[PDB]
Amino acid sequence: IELRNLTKWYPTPHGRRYVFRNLNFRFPDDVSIGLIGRNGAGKSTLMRLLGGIEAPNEGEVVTDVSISWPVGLSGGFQGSLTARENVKFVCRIYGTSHEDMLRKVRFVEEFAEIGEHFDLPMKTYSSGMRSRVAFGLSMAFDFDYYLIDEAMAVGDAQFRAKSRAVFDSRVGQANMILVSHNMNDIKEYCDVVVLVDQGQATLYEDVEAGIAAYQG
Amino acid sequence: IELRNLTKWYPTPHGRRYVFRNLNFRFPDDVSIGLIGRNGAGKSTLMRLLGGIEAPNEGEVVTDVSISWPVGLSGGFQGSLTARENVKFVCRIYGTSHEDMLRKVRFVEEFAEIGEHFDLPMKTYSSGMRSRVAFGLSMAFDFDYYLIDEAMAVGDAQFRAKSRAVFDSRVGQANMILVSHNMNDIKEYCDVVVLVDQGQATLYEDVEAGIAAYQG
Amino acid sequence: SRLTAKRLQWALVYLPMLVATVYFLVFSADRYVSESVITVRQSREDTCYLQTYIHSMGLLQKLDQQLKLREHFGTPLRDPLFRLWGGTSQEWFLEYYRSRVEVLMDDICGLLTVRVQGFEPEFAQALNRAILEESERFVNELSHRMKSLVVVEPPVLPEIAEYPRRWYNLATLLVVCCLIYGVVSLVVATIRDHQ
Amino acid sequence: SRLTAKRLQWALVYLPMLVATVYFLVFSADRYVSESVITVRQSREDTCYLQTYIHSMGLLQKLDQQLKLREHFGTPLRDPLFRLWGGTSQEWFLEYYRSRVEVLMDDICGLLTVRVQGFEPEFAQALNRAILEESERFVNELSHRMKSLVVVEPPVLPEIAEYPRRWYNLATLLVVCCLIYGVVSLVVATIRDHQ
Amino acid sequence: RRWYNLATLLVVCCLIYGVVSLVVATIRDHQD
Amino acid sequence: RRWYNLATLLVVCCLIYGVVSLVVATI
Amino acid sequence: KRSPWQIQQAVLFALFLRELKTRLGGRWLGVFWVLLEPVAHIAVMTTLFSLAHRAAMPSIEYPVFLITGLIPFFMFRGLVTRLMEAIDSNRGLFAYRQVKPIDTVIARAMLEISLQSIVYLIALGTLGWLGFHFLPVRALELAGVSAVLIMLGASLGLFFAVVTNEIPQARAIVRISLLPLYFVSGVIFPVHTIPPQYLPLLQLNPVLHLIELSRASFFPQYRVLQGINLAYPAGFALLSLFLALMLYRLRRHQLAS
Amino acid sequence: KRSPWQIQQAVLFALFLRELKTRLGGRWLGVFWVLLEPVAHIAVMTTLFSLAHRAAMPSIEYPVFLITGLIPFFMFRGLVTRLMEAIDSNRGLFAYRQVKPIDTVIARAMLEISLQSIVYLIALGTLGWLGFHFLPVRALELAGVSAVLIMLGASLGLFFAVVTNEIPQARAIVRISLLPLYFVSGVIFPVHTIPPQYLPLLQLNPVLHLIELSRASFFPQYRVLQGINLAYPAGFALLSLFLALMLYRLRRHQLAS
């Protein structure tokens, strides 16, 4: 990826809040990236931009590699439905056959330790079950860049345990870009760190240096 | 509080999921409580029950002390509005005068390091700003029992810093019941722990014992 | 602030009530009505002619010359809202006479109903009789110049004052005053809170 | 999966197309129509009488006795769907004659329009003339025992076969077959995916 | 009416051009 | 009627200017 | 500890202004809409049926004949069609231990009662200004009929809101249920032209009785059709209110989430 | 890398069945609703205007006179009133880098085109079964008129959906905009009884022209009123489609959140 020049603003009533201005940053390669940022920064906005959810209006991004959809903690799923039809829709949306779709759905149910609640509408899930389903779906598909937005903050220890097990079963061919507020996790889940402040974005190799820049 | 016998279920299509059955547990006194639970348990449901959001249908709870409303990470606020009218509504809902209402709103703006975004509709907040506003509102009102549902998981270090500063300015007269998935925080934010599993609820004095029971 | 103290009810509920009662029971004068029901047959055209002519200025001139309405309608000195002040304009006198003699038309049967209000019970019946006789004469002369009047119910002599309605008006204006009080109080609370 | 595997296209689109083309362009026989426009004047009542009588069984009996319709309508051996099979029930013959002679009534002007279909150009005009003459005779007899026929446009001798429409029916038929093909394919995809 | 027919045909043809062009532009830009 | 036709032409001109400007702004 | 009536008053007031800023709107287009739509309808019917009304009965004029039946009808229509979202659109606020669904359904009713009373007052004032009759002959009867109409409409709105919580499709139903009610009630045209043989099916509509009673108690010469009474709408309002309160109390705890 | 047309087909198919289970409903009440509501309306109009229609013109019967104008009208009505939520109710799904608003507005149109074609076919079959005319005399003209009606309706729905994203109140507008269209289009009653002096205002409704052309091309003796043509609706459909696509492409990036 290249992440060429861009400008990102939103139609605020008080004129226009130019969140991103003239950002020309080249992301590192073959290393997990940790976005730290702060409140009021554009980590989620940048996260969606990486996922192609909304196109830049005064810029563009070059991505010559497959990008998985963002996970997040809200959005990306359809309510009033059970997870079963949602996962059938998500494997149908990428033009798949029946055998791979069925086996990937089966993997989705196997990863998530969910009983009858898997056959329940999207309204009747807790804050953790939806995140677990989304996280299991994220590593279901084959990609290179896995986009994580603090999707474990609502999970138990076993969730982190088998998520780490799955990722270590899938290391060597894909890398992860994640943003979280628990830096004990990002210390051991990332290689290099990127800090964004006042719209500006900066990269930090050493994780401790990025932590100090966060708290600086 | 007493928390007498109760039965809690939901109208699931597959009969009825009896989440809570014959729970007769007496909470401790003058100590911060930490709910650990697990995915599929009823921490949030029990959290709402403590807040009186929904009354028990086959039981009741005796609470001879003022209970603050739950904070949570979703719900409890009104969308399509700025935080200003929301805080005027929340100080008007408890039958307050004008001077105390204005000073409490001013405290709300002072606690949250939010600039012009405080005068923006509820749609255009990040995952952290709404939690910051709700958390500042929680310690705005005077109560005894502060109900916290992992409301810091989307905050920065300064958020935890001044939240701890405010709480330590308000210790000695109120206690906190909190649920979170980062037990480094609950180790130093709580006195005794309560674990709920298979609808059943259990109390643990030593925090390390509760942690081991969680991971056991 | 100023429009927030308790005086607001006295601004809308109390003082209008007091002035209404003092007028209605102390100052008011009785207005006996006399009702007659007539028609024209030999249909709708001549009845409409009569309905227009009854309110006409020429009939008022004839009645003023014949019964001296202007002198009589100014006899109640106590009532300040319903007396014909001396020296008033002729147009105001025509408006007053139009306001007193009430003419109603029935759609199905085509029957004119004349309700004449006088300050003396004999005067109202006399005015009704004069109106009926002059209307009949006009219908005869008009048709003859270019028909008869059928009196279904003749003018009656009243016994008590059908007008004004003291307790009825007091109750309905009280209801209106509390409705306005509630609306104004809600508006005032809205301004005093959103400020 | 047997409904799938590309044979469904031949199932609804191709084979119906071939059968229609083979019978429509090779088996079919020409049906020349003859059109006349008449009315009754001396209004709506007698025109309705005539409209009912034209389709009546007695007129069909008279026409069968006079022109030998049953022998002629069975002469095209090539056309399988539009020939009158020998020995058929009399009710079917009445239905056939009702299907051939088409009578239309105009609301504004009250003009009957008779379109008679024959397998020979002279036969259609002869049948139209016989129908018009017998209808006039029936109207006159009804007027006398219990009126005249005004022929606005007399029967005409056709030159080419207005019926059947080969390319028109073929094109619209294919239009319908592809619509049904799309609907059935969508339904089949729905079942094969939701299973 | 040669000129009126020519102008009407030009307007309709330009509108058809626009409809086809935007449909093609959408179907080509959606690939992302 | 001078001003009547002038106002009608003003309305028509404003509408066509808006349409043409929007069309050019597309491409 | 303050009395529950005081906290009810505080809750109702807070919900009142809260609902005001959104019902009226921050664009201030709500007031222009609700005092431009009624006059637009008034101009429409008159332009299409002035001659028809003058043929039917010439005793009273159309601009004053229709307003007195329209504004109460619009009031009832609004307080039966806006109470649907009094709970569903206010669901996210049910997290403060004091707010109850009955508060949110009656606060909107109070708001729109005030709004329609204001529009009625200003419409009567402007109609008197234009040179038309604007004084009710028997105002007490009009007030009583309006009160019973409010009772019936608020009861029906509460019952519908209680029933509709499971299936939010019911909006559409009331919307189609709102089409004949604007026509079969006789607000646009007098009921004189209605054929007698159809009359029973017209007499089963309570709002028709209420509109007819309002028109009779407003004008000095309006005559009611035989069979129109006040016992039927009063009994309907009472029974409907009983069953609505009965339902709401049956499913009070389920009114959440 | 597969062609964008293949991924369009996959996206459209996935959105198709997805939309099917919710438009039809899991209760299977959708099919019963959409084949019980039309016959209920048919029974209503006939019961209230059979004598009036027989007085107006007796050439054709009411049960077949009204269906041919009703079902296309219901089709256009639905594809102009359900495309409102094709984006707003499907907003939460716009997070997979391939789903675009044009896909979600045209998938619903394809679904309801299929549904209304099925209801038309079954209604024609049952009307032929009951003993009524059920073969279009000139079916090609009916197909062309239906195609241009679909073009106009889908264009108007797309334009309205693009415009309405800022203010979701516009539903109400189209709802009131849906009331005269059911009446002024002449679907319920023939346009013969309409006074000529009012005729220009009737001629400005394209759906009236389309319904009249469908009725003329279906029955063998229907006569069109003077001034009714196909140039006006075709030009309206083309210009509206151009402006709708023009708007959608202007505000494509804002169609998110």
Ligand SMILES: Nc1ncnc2c1ncn2[C@@H]1O[C@H](COP(=O)(O)OP(=O)(O)O)[C@@H](O)[C@H]1O
């Ligand atoms: N729908 C919207 N309309 C207007 N402004 C928005 C919208 N969504 C987000 N924003 C603005 O864009 C910024 C994005 O911040 P975000 O990246 O969500 O913060 P974080 O990285 O902490 O999640 C916010 O400050 C917010 O004010």
Ligand SMILES: Nc1ncnc2c1ncn2[C@@H]1O[C@H](COP(=O)(O)OP(=O)(O)O)[C@@H](O)[C@H]1O
């Ligand atoms: N609206 C609802 N309808 C039906 N069931 C629900 C609803 N909300 C919650 N539940 C059920 O109640 C349980 C409550 O779990 P919860 O306390 O939210 O978990 P956690 O403590 O991890 O937040 C869930 O398992 C869910 O299945």
Ligand code: ALF
């Ligand atoms: F919903 Al959770 F921990 F599973 F708050």
Ligand code: ALF
């Ligand atoms: F403030 Al955030 F994710 F919205 F850290």
